[PDB]
Design an enzyme around this catalytic site. Structure first.
Site, PDB file in Angstrom:
ATOM      1  N   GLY C  30       0.652  -1.236  -0.095  1.00 30.29           N
ATOM      2  CA  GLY C  30       0.045   0.009   0.115  1.00 30.29           C
ATOM      3  C   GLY C  30       0.816   1.225  -0.019  1.00 30.29           C
ATOM      4  O   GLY C  30       1.888   1.084  -0.558  1.00 30.29           O
ATOM      5  N   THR C  31       0.202   2.401   0.461  1.00 31.79           N
ATOM      6  CA  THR C  31       0.925   3.457   0.634  1.00 31.79           C
ATOM      7  C   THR C  31       1.391   3.899   2.047  1.00 31.79           C
ATOM      8  O   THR C  31       0.894   3.534   3.001  1.00 31.79           O
ATOM      9  CB  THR C  31      -0.126   4.954   0.208  1.00 31.79           C
ATOM     10  OG1 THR C  31      -0.575   4.590  -1.152  1.00 31.79           O
ATOM     11  CG2 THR C  31       0.501   6.131   0.233  1.00 31.79           C
ATOM     12  N   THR C  32       2.714   4.343   2.147  1.00 31.09           N
ATOM     13  CA  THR C  32       3.504   4.526   3.405  1.00 31.09           C
ATOM     14  C   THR C  32       2.515   5.661   3.941  1.00 31.09           C
ATOM     15  O   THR C  32       2.552   7.047   3.768  1.00 31.09           O
ATOM     16  CB  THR C  32       4.862   4.902   3.232  1.00 31.09           C
ATOM     17  OG1 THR C  32       5.478   4.005   2.509  1.00 31.09           O
ATOM     18  CG2 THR C  32       5.609   5.044   4.465  1.00 31.09           C
TER      19      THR C  32
END
Lengths: 77, 243, 245, 233, 242, 243, 233, 86
Positions: C30-32
């Protein structure tokens, strides 16, 4: 997977090989060790030293060395 | 095998895509809705020379001003008797009028297709979505005669001339040029029997097929064996006069 | 086959079934999104990857703040992350119904771990494949707890997820020696954009967008605010001030 | 042996996803090709729907909700005659109980976890139906792109279907021009007509098979069919 | 309980439940019947060889719905009696509502209506029961014969029979027996029935049972002595070479 | 067919494969602990590992307060550890609702074991292989320790531990319990009893720790508390002055 | 190939029922190639010694680059490939190593001009999902039950050398036969040829074909056929 | 090997398209958005099968539509069927 007393003599030889700054704390890195052995200890400064190759310096910061300690725990098994 | 929730590589259910094979195993029927009335008919064939065609109903009636037919297993044909016929009376119970064929089909499709593995509120216990091809035709108080069909996949589409059954591949191909906007009731009676002649494997007989019609005044009216035999004799006299 | 991928109701020799191990790869893809725990409050961070110009910034917010006093943020799968939001905010409404008091952070953490441990017991129930990061301000002080997809959660002075989870927390330990208790958390907001900027080196593809939703022990005292206007561009320019190229 | 990581709903793939969603993403291209966008004050939905025969007509995927909102779904609609009708019931339920304009957030928030319950709770299949929902409120028009994976987002415009990527990318350069021009809904609908020509590389533009929806501030929701689209062909 | 379905729809239309539900009749005893003018005759047989019991103490195919309607079939044993009791309650349900006896047409629909939920809805498996339904209508002496399939398919018949090798036995009645010209005397239906019963069970007439359905609530069960009267007449003109 | 990797059935060896994997590795957490009983009190000591600088030491604990007089010792997976903890705390309040006395050791240990034994009957629901040890001080009988095994085994334990070194500390304690012929520690001054249990713990480890690296607690008469950072550090320094 | 920059397909997969006219088509096309034909199966390939099924066959693969105009059909891949979970019960490692040995010849270098690769099996995905990955298979042969009018030529092919009474109608004969394959249609004519043995028919009549469909498919065939045994796996 | 993204699949297709003759009507960001979770092994089959579509059409070079027709080639089960669409 012993405590600091078991891996203490390994860290001394591990320290004498790497030439870096004289300010370091390896006591906090002992707790960071999970599933690490005498071969995984060499991996610490091995990967941490790779980040300083393009930096044109052989000094290894204590936080940069701990970054490679966590990196070995991800690739375990 | 495995869970029913498994889809096709295109994202569709297997029982829905495979529902077309049970239609070819049934009876071939071609409905037509003309400017005058709506032509309905099916094919009884024969399972034996001792078979009686009087007590078998392959064409049902949901309401007076509309009609219905079936091609497939006869089990799912009775599921709409408690659903489509009930909804037609439910409409008269509330709005007390003739339900629109356009709205009735979509209303039946809500009660037609319900299934799955399981659900508490709705009943998904039904395994096979449909084993029969149901025809929906009638007269609208606004637009007019509308010929629809209940597909074994569960969807619905507007059909000017619809052909179902195993012979639907060769019958619908020629049906494109046969169906016209000027086609009347009498002209469509000999047209269906002429197409079914190339379909039916045996000689045309009053017991091998059943036809009916939907009238905006008298309503749904079946063709008696004495009247059906008259249309058979008119076909033999018409085919001999074509050349 | 092995049974650990199909069924989570059996026992693994390592204590973690292969099905639970698959949830870790879903979160790291996913996104950090990081987190901040300091003396002045708890600050979150969230990033939205822009696939095309059709996406509109300042719309999708992965940070879900329960009332004004508890923030939460997830990663990985969207539905598994928002499924806990409806249950977490429902128990908070049921808490104020019975006790007529605001819910503290430690009381909020046990309700989350109970749903994860219960879904792994039933073989017919699909467990959670996402990680949960939540925090806020309570009657005691700043607390930050991250719920792993396996269900294990405990005290965290920092949070990270996505790409370089343990690598992003390396900058958090550098602030520990500088500030023992964290001191001013306003500068950490600028440090948050720099930590997220550290992951932008290898992950750079298209344009990036950063959003920050925080809460403070001093300024808000339990209220809720949002970074916008001058504070929005000031933290972004700070991350690019160190490395311009 | 892909039956393990696919046929099972509760199983997890080695990549961290569900293979049942991958087949649902393909169902978008297997269905009809639709085009939609949001110009703010006006909104245009152009959906081309193919039929099964020359003598046959398609079925309407678009379901009318209220005057200030509308929805157009792509791909297929196995369960949409239930879900979208249940969602349509929630459209009036929010108006007659909560008195809500039903923006694109909560409308896609409940449907996000609703399709997830089929995977979470055993005994049901995933829906796997793409939904494009637009609505108007005091903040203007907003577009909702709903993927079978529970995607909740807002786009100025999107085109999903078979070979519909050409109309999606080519309109990004002029996208800022379309949204800034308001008050002329005719030119906004014609902008979607050019998207249909780019999405069809085989057949030509149809007449009865073309469906166009529009919603706005003063103009309510309606579906253009027959002689209504004669000026847009 | 069980949320799923016990049946699976077939890709080509070949369904495991439909497969062995028809062969359940092929494994069981044959049920022979023929219509008539004022009555209808239903014959049967028995698989057991050694008989230590009596016909009256142990019922097999004997069941009754209406007063003048006797319903005899073989698809099974246990699953067969379940549909009979539900039909008798349904037959009473018309007496609790319609106040009039139900026609044979719906009596076939009700048996297939319960089988309709088996093939459609899940949680319960279908049966292998195939019922041959007979009897009259109120103020009507015309009989009826309906062959009920386990899939819910029924049709009108005359000489149709189901059982072991019943398709070949029925071919004997497709020519000599004329459906257009049914016999008059009640005993004429028995003469053609006994000749069809000797093509399966052959000897062991103790297993042969004949149930004649008569109007005005009358049921005549023929004995072994009356059956042997027609057996002698079979070998009279057949063995003689003309 | 025959494999327990999904369903649970009796193996030909007479032992369930699920029971095997539950008993095999409880040490995947890689942590040790110990439990001993004093005269009027109970002393428990658990090792603690903090592999980060961002971890709050007050949050991480393997000893949760159940009742006022009751402690708990748990070793295993963290998410499954609180499953039995939240249930035991909910069941501890049920004792006062039904009775209005303090939870005795013979009940709470029996209820969690019987609840875990039901999981042997249920094939769909997963049991817990987490080590469960309920420690407290009874008023009439004094100190008591009952270790609940995941298979339903619970009995009186004068002392218990965790990890692979459980048998190593048992050897040193068995020699002291054989000569004195007493199960508990008859020595008073629990402050010196904590240091007595650390001596047996050092022999298995061989290293020292800090105030936050050891989870230690003392169950007293009608009270149970948790040693803070200053109370733990005071005992680790004072033990060096004696021996 | 050099001007456009495209290359012909090398590897190709055959999946479906066991020789219903799928395999019959594989051996028919190879005859018109007019090249060297070599048949190697997978069942005997196991043997015992390591290298007997790999190194010994590698000599055939090495000779394929030496001697040109060679065509080899790989047979019985179910005894070679297949998916593993516990990584084998033993003895199948060399069976799996032969699968990997086939990759080595296609790994570093190989011309596709004089060397062709074709498999045979009953289901496409039963192999190793890494084996089925592209580049050792460029195209797949999709073999299923075709339409009705398409198979009308099959009735003609069998009747080219068969004496049939003039005036027979094949339209009504094809209606009795549902979706089927090429070999299943020959079985109808095979029993029809037996109708002229016992009943002693001069030629093949219409009543022989109309009855054979109910005699063979309905009457004789009954159970024992492949229906639900292919989905994906 | 990670799942290649839009810009990642574009650079992979540029390698196999060096020997390909095109009409310069192709947009690299346009074709990558229609592709999802296609590694370089599957991306290579797109450029190879692209010219095979133009083989029956007699085209001198591939175009932007021919690369889309590469997806129409049967690899991932992209082929057609009956019922809902016809």
């Amino acid at each position: 997977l012993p405590n600091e007393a078991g891996r203490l003599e390994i860290f001394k030889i591990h320290t004498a090989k790497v030439k870096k700054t004289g300010e370091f704390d390896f006591e906090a890195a002992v707790k960071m060790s999970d599933g690490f052995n005498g071969a995984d200890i060499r991996n610490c400064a091995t990967e941490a030293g790779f980040f300083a190759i393009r930096d044109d310096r052989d000094h290894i910061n204590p936080d940069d060395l701990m970054k490679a300690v966590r990196k070995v725990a991800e690739v375990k098994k | 095998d495995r869970g029913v929730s498994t889809f096709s590589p295109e994202g569709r259910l297997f029982q829905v895509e495979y529902s077309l094979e049970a239609i070819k195993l049934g009876s071939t029927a071609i409905g037509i809705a003309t400017k005058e009335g709506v032509v309905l008919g099916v094919e009884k064939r024969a399972t034996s020379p001792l078979l009686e065609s009087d007590s078998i109903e392959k064409i049902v009636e949901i309401d007076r001003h509309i009609g219905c037919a079936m091609s497939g297993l006869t089990a799912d044909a009775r599921s709409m008797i408690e659903h489509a016929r009930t909804a037609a009376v439910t409409h008269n119970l509330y709005y007390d009028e003739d339900i629109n064929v356009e709205s009735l089909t979509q209303s039946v499709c809500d009660l037609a297709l319900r299934f799955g593995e399981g659900a508490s509120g709705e009943e998904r216990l039904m395994s096979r979505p449909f084993g029969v091809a149901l025809l929906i035709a009638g007269h609208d108080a606004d637009d007019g005669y509308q010929l629809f069909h209940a597909e074994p996949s569960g969807t619905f589409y507007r059909y000017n001339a619809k052909a179902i059954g195993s012979g639907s591949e060769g019958a619908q191909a020629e049906l494109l040029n046969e169906w016209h906007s000027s086609l009347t009731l009498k002209e469509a009676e000999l047209l269906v029997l002429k197409i079914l002649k190339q379909v039916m494997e045996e000689k045309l007989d009053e017991n091998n097929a059943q036809l009916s019609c939907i009238t905006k005044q008298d309503g749904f009216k079946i063709y008696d064996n004495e009247k059906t035999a008259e249309l058979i004799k008119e076909l033999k006299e018409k085919e001999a006069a074509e050349s | 086959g092995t049974g650990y991928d199909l069924s989570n109701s059996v026992f693994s020799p390592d204590g973690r079934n292969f099905q639970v191990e698959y949830a870790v790869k879903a979160v790291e893809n996913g996104t950090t999104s990081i987190g901040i725990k300091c003396n002045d409050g708890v600050v979150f961070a969230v990033e939205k990857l822009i696939t095309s110009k059709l996406l509109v910034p300042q719309k999708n917010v992965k940070i879900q703040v329960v009332d004004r006093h508890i923030g939460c943020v997830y990663s990985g799968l969207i539905p598994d992350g928002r499924h806990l939001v409806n249950r977490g905010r429902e128990e908070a409404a049921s808490f104020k119904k019975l006790y007529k008091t605001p819910i503290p952070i430690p009381a909020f953490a046990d309700r989350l771990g109970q749903y994860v441990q219960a879904h792994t017991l039933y073989n017919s129930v699909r467990p959670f494949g996402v990680s949960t990061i939540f925090g806020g301000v309570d009657k005691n002080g700043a607390h930050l707890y991250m719920l792993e997809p396996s269900g294990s959660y405990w005290g965290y002075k920092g949070a990270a997820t996505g790409k370089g989870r343990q690598s992003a927390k390396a900058e958090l330990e550098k602030l520990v020696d500088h500030h023992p208790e964290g001191l001013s958390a306003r500068e950490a907001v600028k440090q948050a954009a720099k930590i997220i900027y550290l992951a932008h080196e290898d992950n750079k593809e298209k344009d990036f967008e950063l959003e920050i939703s925080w809460c403070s022990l001093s300024e808000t005292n339990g209220l809720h605010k949002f970074v916008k206007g001058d504070l929005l561009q000031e933290a972004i320019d700070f991350a690019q001030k160190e490395i311009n190229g | 042996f892909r039956n393990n990581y696919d046929g099972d709903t509760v199983t997890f793939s080695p990549t961290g996803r569900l293979f049942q969603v991958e087949y649902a993403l393909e169902a978008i291209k297997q269905g009809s090709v639709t085009v939609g966008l949001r110009s703010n004050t006006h909104a245009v939905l152009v959906a081309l729907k193919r039929n099964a025969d020359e003598l046959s007509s398609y079925q309407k995927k678009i379901i009318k909700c209220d005057e200030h909102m509308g929805l157009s779904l792509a791909g297929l609609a196995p369960d949409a005659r239930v879900l979208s009708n249940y969602l349509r019931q929630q459209c009036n339920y929010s108006s007659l109980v909560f008195n809500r304009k039903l923006a694109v957030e909560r409308a896609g928030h409940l449907l996000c976890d609703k399709a997830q319950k089929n995977t979470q709770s055993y005994g049901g299949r995933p829906y796997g139906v793409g939904l494009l929902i637009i609505g108007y409120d005091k903040s203007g028009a907003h577009l909702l792109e709903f993927q079978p994976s529970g995607n909740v987002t807002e786009l100025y415009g999107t085109a999903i279907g078979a070979r519909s990527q050409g109309a999606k990318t080519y309109l990004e350069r002029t996208l800022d021009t379309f949204i800034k021009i308001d008050g002329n809904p005719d030119e906004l609908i014609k902008a979607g007509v050019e998207a249909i020509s780019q999405s069809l590389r085989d057949e030509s533009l149809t007449v009865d098979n073309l469906s166009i929806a529009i919603v706005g501030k003063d103009t309510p929701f309606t579906i253009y069919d027959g002689e209504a689209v004669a000026k847009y062909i | 309980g069980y949320d799923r379905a016990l049946s699976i729809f077939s890709p080509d239309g070949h369904i495991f439940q439909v497969e062995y539900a028809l062969e359940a009749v092929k494994r069981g005893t044959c049920a022979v019947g023929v219509k008539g003018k004022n009555c209808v005759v239903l014959g049967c047989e028995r698989r057991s060889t050694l008989k230590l019991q009596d016909t009256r103490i142990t019922p097999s195919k004997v069941s009754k719905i209406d007063s003048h309607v006797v319903l005899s079939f073989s698809g099974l044993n246990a699953d067969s009696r379940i549909l009979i009791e539900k039909a008798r309650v349904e037959a009473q349900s018309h007496r609790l509502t319609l106040e009039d006896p139900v026609t044979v047409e719906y009596l076939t629909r009700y048996v297939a209506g319960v089988q309709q939920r088996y093939t459609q809805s899940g949680g319960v498996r279908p049966f292998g029961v195939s019922t041959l339904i007979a009897g009259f209508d109120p103020r009507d002496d015309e009989p009826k014969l309906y062959q009920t399939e386990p899939s819910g398919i029924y049709s009108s018949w005359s000489a149709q029979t189901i059982g072991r090798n019943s398709k070949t036995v029925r071919e004997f009645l497709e020519k000599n027996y004329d459906r257009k010209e049914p016999p008059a005397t009640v005993e004429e239906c028995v003469k053609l029935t006994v000749r069809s019963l000797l093509e399966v069970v052959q000897t062991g007439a103790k297993n042969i049972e004949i149930t004649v359905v008569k109007p005005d609530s009358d049921i005549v069960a023929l004995s072994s002595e009356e059956i042997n009267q027609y057996v002698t007449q079979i070998e009279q003109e057949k063995q003689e070479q003309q | 067919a025959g494999y327990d990797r999904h369903i649970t059935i009796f193996s030909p060896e007479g032992r369930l494969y699920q029971v095997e994997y539950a008993f095999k590795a409880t040490n995947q957490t890689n942590i040790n602990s110990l439990a001993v009983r004093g005269k009027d009190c109970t002393v428990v000591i658990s090792q603690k590992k903090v592999p980060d600088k961002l971890l709050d030491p007050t949050t991480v604990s393997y000893i949760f307060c159940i009742s006022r007089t009751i402690g708990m010792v748990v070793n295993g997976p963290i998410p499954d550890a609180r499953n039995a903890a939240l249930r035991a705390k909910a069941e501890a309040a049920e004792f006062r609702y039904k009775y209005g006395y303090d939870m005795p050791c013979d009940v709470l240990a029996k209820r969690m074991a019987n609840l875990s034994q039901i999981y042997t009957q249920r094939a769909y629901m997963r049991p817990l292989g987490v080590i469960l040890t309920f420690v407290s001080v009874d008023e009439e009988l004094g100190p008591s320790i009952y270790k609940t095994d995941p298979a339903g085994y619970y009995v009186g334990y004068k002392a218990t531990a965790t990890g692979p070194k459980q048998q190593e500390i048992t050897t040193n304690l068995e020699n002291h319990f054989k000569k004195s012929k007493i199960d508990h520690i008859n020595e008073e001054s629990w402050e010196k009893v904590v240091e007595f249990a650390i001596t047996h713990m050092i022999d298995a480890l061989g290293t020292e720790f800090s105030k936050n690296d050891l989870e230690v607690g003392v169950a007293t008469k009608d009270k149970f508390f948790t040693l803070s950072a200053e109370n733990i550090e005071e005992r680790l320094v004072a033990i060096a002055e004696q021996d | 190939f050099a001007t456009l920059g495209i290359d012909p397909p090398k590897g190709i997969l055959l999946y479906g029922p066991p020789g219903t006219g799928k395999t019959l088509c594989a051996r028919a096309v190879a005859n018109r190639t007019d090249a060297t034909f070599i048949r190697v199966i997978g069942s005997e390939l196991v043997q015992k010694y390591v290298g007997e099924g790999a190194r010994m066959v590698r000599e055939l693969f090495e000779m394929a680059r030496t001697k040109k105009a060679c065509i080899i059909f790989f047979d019985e891949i179910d005894a070679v490939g297949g998916a593993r979970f516990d990584d084998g019960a033993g003895g199948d490692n060399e069976v799996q190593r032969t699968m990997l040995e086939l990759i080595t010849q296609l790994d570093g270098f190989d011309p596709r001009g004089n060397i062709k690769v074709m498999f045979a099996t009953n289901r496409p995905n039963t192999l190793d999902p890494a084996l089925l990955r592209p580049g050792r298979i460029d195209r797949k042969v999709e073999f299923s039950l075709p339409d009705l009018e398409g198979r009308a030529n099959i009735f003609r092919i069998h009747s080219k050398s068969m004496s049939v009474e003039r005036g027979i109608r094949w339209e009504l004969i094809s209606r009795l036969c549902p979706n089927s394959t090429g070999a299943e249609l020959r079985s109808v004519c095979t029993e029809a040829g037996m109708f002229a043995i016992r009943a002693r028919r001069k030629v093949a009549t219409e009543k022989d074909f109309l009855k054979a469909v109910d005699k063979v498919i309905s009457g004789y065939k009954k159970f024992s056929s492949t229906s639900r045994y292919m989905q994906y796996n | 090997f990670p799942l290649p993204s839009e810009d990642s699949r574009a650079q992979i297709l540029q390698i196999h398209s060096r020997k390909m003759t095109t009409d310069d009507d192709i947009n690299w960001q346009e074709l990558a958005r229609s592709t999802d979770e296609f590694n370089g092994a599957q991306l290579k089959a797109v450029t190879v099968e692209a010219g095979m579509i133009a083989l029956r059409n007699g085209q001198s070079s591939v175009k932007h539509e021919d690369f889309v027709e590469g997806i129409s080639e049967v690899q991932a089960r992209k082929s057609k069927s009956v019922s809902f669409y016809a």
